[PDB]
Amino acid sequence: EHLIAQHSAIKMLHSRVKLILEYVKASEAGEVPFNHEILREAYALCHCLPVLSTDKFKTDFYDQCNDVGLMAYLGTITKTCNTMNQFVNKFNVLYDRQ
Amino acid sequence: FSFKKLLDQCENQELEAPGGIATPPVYGQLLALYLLHNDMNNARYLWKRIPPAIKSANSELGGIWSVGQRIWQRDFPGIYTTINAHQWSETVQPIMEALRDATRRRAFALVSQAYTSIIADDFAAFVGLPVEEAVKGILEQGWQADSTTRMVLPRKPQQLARLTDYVAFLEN
Amino acid sequence: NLLEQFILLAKGTSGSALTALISQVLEAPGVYVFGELLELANVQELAEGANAAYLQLLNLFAYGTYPDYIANKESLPELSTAQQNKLKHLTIVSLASRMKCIPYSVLLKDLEMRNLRELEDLIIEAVYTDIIQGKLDQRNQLLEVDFCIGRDIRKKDINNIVKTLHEWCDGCEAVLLGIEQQVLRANQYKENHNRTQQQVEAEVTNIKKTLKA
Amino acid sequence: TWELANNMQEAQSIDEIYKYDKKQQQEILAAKPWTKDHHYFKYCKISALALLKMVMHARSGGNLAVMGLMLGKVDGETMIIMDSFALPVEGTETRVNAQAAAYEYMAAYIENAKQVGRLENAIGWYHSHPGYGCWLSGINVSTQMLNQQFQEPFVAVVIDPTRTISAGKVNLGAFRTYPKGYKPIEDFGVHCKQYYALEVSYFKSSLDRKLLELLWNKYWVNTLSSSSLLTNADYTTGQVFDLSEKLEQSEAQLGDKLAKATRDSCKTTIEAIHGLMSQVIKDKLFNQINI
Numbered sequence: 132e133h134l135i136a137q138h139s140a141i142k143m144l145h146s147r148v149k150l151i152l153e154y155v156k157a158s159e160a161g162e163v164p165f166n167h168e169i170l171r172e173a174y175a176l177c178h179c180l181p182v183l184s185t186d187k188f189k190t191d192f193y194d195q196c197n198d199v200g201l202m203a204y205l206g207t208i209t210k211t212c213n214t215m216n217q218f219v220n221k222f223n224v225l226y227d228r229q
Numbered sequence: 230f231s232f233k234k235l236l237d238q239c240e241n242q243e244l245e246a247p248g249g250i251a252t253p254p255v256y257g258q259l260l261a262l263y264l265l266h267n268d269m270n271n272a273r274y275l276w277k278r279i280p281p282a283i284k285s286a287n288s289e290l291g292g293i294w295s296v297g298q299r300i301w302q303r304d305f306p307g308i309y310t311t312i313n314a315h316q317w318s319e320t321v322q323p324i325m326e327a328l329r330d331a332t333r334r335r336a337f338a339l340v341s342q343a344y345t346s347i348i349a350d351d352f353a354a355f356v357g358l359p360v361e362e363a364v365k366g367i368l369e370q371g372w373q374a375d376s377t378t379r380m381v382l383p384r385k386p387q388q389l390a391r392l393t394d395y396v397a398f399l400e401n
Numbered sequence: 402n403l404l405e406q407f408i409l410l411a412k413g414t415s416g417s418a419l420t421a422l423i424s425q426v427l428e429a430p431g432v433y434v435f436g437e438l439l440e441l442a443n444v445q446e447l448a449e450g451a452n453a454a455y456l457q458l459l460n461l462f463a464y465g466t467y468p469d470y471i472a473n474k475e476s477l478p479e480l481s482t483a484q485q486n487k488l489k490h491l492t493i494v495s496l497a498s499r500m501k502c503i504p505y506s507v508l509l510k511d512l513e514m515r516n517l518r519e520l521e522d523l524i525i526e527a528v529y530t531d532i533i534q535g536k537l538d539q540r541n542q543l544l545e546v547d548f549c550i551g552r553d554i555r556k557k558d559i560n561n562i563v564k565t566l567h568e569w570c571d572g573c574e575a576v577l578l579g580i581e582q583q584v585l586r587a588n589q590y591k592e593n594h595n596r597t598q599q600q601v602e603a604e605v606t607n608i609k610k611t612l613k614a
Numbered sequence: 615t616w617e618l619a620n621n622m623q624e625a626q627s628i629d630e631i632y633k634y635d636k637k638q639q640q641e642i643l644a645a646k647p648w649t650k651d652h653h654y655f656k657y658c659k660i661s662a663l664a665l666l667k668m669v670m671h672a673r674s675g676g677n678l679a680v681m682g683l684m685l686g687k688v689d690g691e692t693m694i695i696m697d698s699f700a701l702p703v704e705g706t707e708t709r710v711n712a713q714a715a716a717y718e719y720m721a722a723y724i725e726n727a728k729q730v731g732r733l734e735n736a737i738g739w740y741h742s743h744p745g746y747g748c749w750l751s752g753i754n755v756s757t758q759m760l761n762q763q764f765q766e767p768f769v770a771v772v773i774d775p776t777r778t779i780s781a782g783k784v785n786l787g788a789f790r791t792y793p794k795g796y797k798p799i800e801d802f803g804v805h806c807k808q809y810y811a812l813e814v815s816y817f818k819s820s821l822d823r824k825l826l827e828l829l830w831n832k833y834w835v836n837t838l839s840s841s842s843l844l845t846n847a848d849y850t851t852g853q854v855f856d857l858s859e860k861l862e863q864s865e866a867q868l869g870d871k872l873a874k875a876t877r878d879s880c881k882t883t884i885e886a887i888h889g890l891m892s893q894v895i896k897d898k899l900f901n902q903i904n905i
Contacts, residue, residue: 133888134393134584135617136827138577140834141899145573152566159559167436170559175551177565178498180904185502192897199843199890203395206883209861210399213876392891393583397590399880399887569903576899581616588618 151176232327236262250280253287254320260293261324264300265331272297289318296328305336306354333357341383349379403431404438415443420455427462428483433491433532434553435463454478463553467492467512490527497533497546505542625820631694632819634733639687649766652796655688658769658788659815660695662822667698669784672742672775678707679742683720685727686737688767695737695769699723707744740771748772748787749803758791758809769812788812838896843889853882 155173157163223229239259243251256279263272276294284290292315299311309332312325336355340347352366353359366381367374373382407426411419423444426432438444439459447456458477461469467488470477480488489512496503496511505517514520524544527533535546554562648654664684671680685697701716724736741754750758750772762768774785791809799806818826843850857878864871 133891134580134587137837137892137895138580139831140837141573141576141580143831143834144838145570145577148566148569148573152563152570155559155563155566159563165556167440167554170554170562171434171436171551173551173562173566174554174558175549177562177904178551179548180565180569180900182900183501184901192893195893196890199886202886203399203883206879207395207399209879210876213872216872388894389579389583389891390586392887392894393587396884396887396891397587399883401591401594565904572899572903576895580895585618 232262232265236266250283253283253289254318256283257287257289257293257321258324260290260297261321261328264293264297265324265328267331267335269297269301273301288315289321292317293321300332305332308332309357341385344383346380346382349374349381352381352383403429404435407432408437408441411438411441411443415446416452419443420447420452423455423459427459427487428481430483430487430530433487433494433550435459436553439463439553462488462491464555466495471513486523486526489523490530490532491552493524493527494532494549495552497535497544497549498552501546503544503546505544508544621820621824628817628823629820631689631817632696634687638689642688642690646766652792655691655693655790656812657692657815658695658812659692659817660686660786660788661697662816662818662826664695664698665784665786665816667700668740668771668773668786669775669778671698671700672773673779675742675744675775677744677776679705679710679744681710681712681716681741682739683736684738684740684771685732685734687734688737693737693769697732697734698740710741737767738769738771740773743772743774745774745776747777747801748774748785749801750789750791750805750809751803752805755791755805755808758789759794762791763793786814788814838899841893841896843886843893850882850886853878857882 151173154163155170158165158170239255239262242255243259260272260275263275276290276297279290295314296308296311299307309329312329317325333356340352340355344352349363350359353363356362363374363381366372366383372384374380375382404426407422407429411422414422423438426435426438444456444459447453454477457473461477470488492511493503493508496508505520508514508524509517509520512520512523514523521537524537528535533546533549535544535548537544668682671682674680680700681703682698682700684695685699686693686695688694699720701712701719703710703712703716705711720736727734743749750770754770754772758768758770761770768790770789770791772785772787772789778785788811789809790812792807797807802809802811857875860871860875860878864875
């Protein structure tokens with residue numbers, strides 16, 4: 132569900148970018164007239180691709196990743212404990228009386 | 230980096246023997262390699278393992294054990310004096326230079342990490358020469374220095390799969 | 402727009418009046434991208450004659466930055482304060498186009514300025530003109546730009562634009578592929594678990610069928 | 615291939631719950647399992663369509679109060695509701711009385727639905743509280759008394775339109791009541807001993823799921839710019855606190871609840887890793903282009 136719901140949105144963004152690239156290529160070749168206004172916006176969009184490549188963002192992202200990793204550790208450690216409890220409960224009946 | 234292959238080759242050479250005791254040169258090379266890798270316990274037990282007869286047969290093992298005893302007490306200045314005191318055969322020749330370089334790097338790291346200001350005499354004894362390594366230290370790496378008291382100030386120097394595996398494990 | 406308002410008068414005239422019109426365009430506020438003005442044949446015909454300096458000035462305004470008006474300062478005619486301010490604003494826009502965190506020292510070197518207060522005032526007035534959007538930071542001596550208008554594009558750089566877009570497309574495709582693989586694996590894992598559970602169930606009930614005799 | 619499973623006509627137990635097993639319903643009604651113990655049904659599952667119909671009726675009521683019925687069934691320990699049906703009742707925002715219009719309306723609408731092909735019956739009623747939380751008043755308590763004591767399968771629903779609109783989350787509240795005699799927190803009111811609360815859950819069919827996902831698909835900008843786990847931090851902290859309390863209760867019990875605690879922890883961990891995965895995917899897609 133999760134990896135598929137946003138996959139469609141990513142595909143839509145891919146389609147829009149592909150359409151823009153096709154228009155730019157057509158303008159370069161000469162099929163469409165040289166509209167010297169859309170190309171400026173295309174250049175501006177091109178120059179804004181590497182978004183937020185600063186050190187503060189990287190540190191915040193790494194902190195977020197570590198926090199989520201710890202939150203997953205606390206939660207794996209309890210599923211393991213629950214399986215542990217079910218195993219000992221089943222063991223205390225088979226190989227050991229009472 | 231090439232010494233690891235020699236290390237394990239000597240290891241399986243040692244592991245089995247026609248009579249349990251190998252030749253003197255291989256014993257000495259293995260002991261020297263243990264000393265080089267800064268693993269003292271295995272070297273000490275290997276020295277304890279050597280039978281007394283072959284131990285006293287060759288004096289090379291005596292010098293190697295003297296170097297090991299010097300390095301065990303962590304007395305840095307004496308290591309350089311005891312490493313070149315005697316003569317070393319070609320079989321153990323390329324061990325001394327590597328060990329000396331490793332000891333120098335370890336002393337450099339220890340001085341840079343555990344010290345904020347150290348008398349130039351002690352630092353120079355740690356490194357090896359109180360003539361030109363002080364100016365080398367201040368110039369090359371920019372370490373601060375001050376005369377009169379002779380004081381130096383060293384300063385210290387594939388993703389989505391894991392997440393989906395965690396999710397699959399948690400959900401099941 | 403302003404360029405449309407200043408463009409229809411440039412058809413019939415040529416010579417000194419045309420150069421005066423382009424000077425007025427370069428002085429008028431609001432105009433910052435001279436794409437259609439340079440595209441006219443009348444402007445391009447100025448190369449042959451005694452008005453090549455104005456053509457060079459227009460080309461420098463359209464594509465070049467402030468240091469380009471350093472080596473050839475004596476060749477071009479004198480500029481008023483409005484033209485110099487507009488050129489400095491264009492240089493700031495060009496610098497902000499590449500990097501999103503402009504250091505103060507780089508701006509001082511590039512704009513040939515002597516005082517930090519004057520540079521900050523120039524940036525403030527550029528923001529007021531609404532060509533770039535951002536904020537200053539004196540503690541780190543930085544200027545952060547969240548959005549800057551694209552400058553003029555010549556008819557040789559477009560290919561490079563294509564390249565960047567192509568790269569983006571490729572990246573998107575790559576992500577898509579990975580997505581599919583991941584979800585597939587996930588599904589398989591789930592199925593496997595269920596299957597083995599079912600197997601165990603079969604086994605135990607089979608045992609029941611052979612123990613209730 | 616890209617979606618792998620897809621759907622031509624296949625379905626699962628999700629689509630199976632929409633049916634009417636006449637023999638099963640007859641035998642559960644005849645057996646009457648809930649008449650023997652007070653602590654019967656605790657799970658109520660209501661379909662989406664009923665939810666939106668109730669919300670629109672409450673909004674169309676405005677500052678005043680509205681009131682209507684609901685349709686569904688009962689299955690084992692759980693209750694199923696899948697239809698909402700408004701009523702033409704009027705009154706002040708503090709009291710509403712069902713006149714003869716509603717009495718002639720519910721029967722007429724039931725007959726019309728039966729003519730259509732509908733086969734469900736009345737299951738309960740919903741009343742909108744404009745502002746004063748979600749709690750049954752004295753008259754509501756008496757009405758629920760009489761309704762659940764005469765028409766044993768029943769349940770009441772109370773929503774808060776104003777708070778739902780202002781906050782952004784729905785105020786659906788499903789309530790059953792303890793009968794008279796059985797005696798064994800100021801938000802719930804003053805009759806907290808007489809009435810209790812129930813959990814709420816929702817469902818939607820395979821066709822409904824596909825249509826909802828395809829309609830919500832025109833939200834791509836918010837989809838890849840939401841950056842969750844930064845907006846639901848309070849919800850996750852509350853969930854972890856409740857997890858700690860449940861873990862303490864399970865540990866005391868061991869001296870089952872452990873399974874419930876494990877499921878809750880798994881849900882919270884899955885949500886957290888989903889947020890991290892979306893963040894990682896966004897970083898890979900946007901911040902790794904053009905150096």
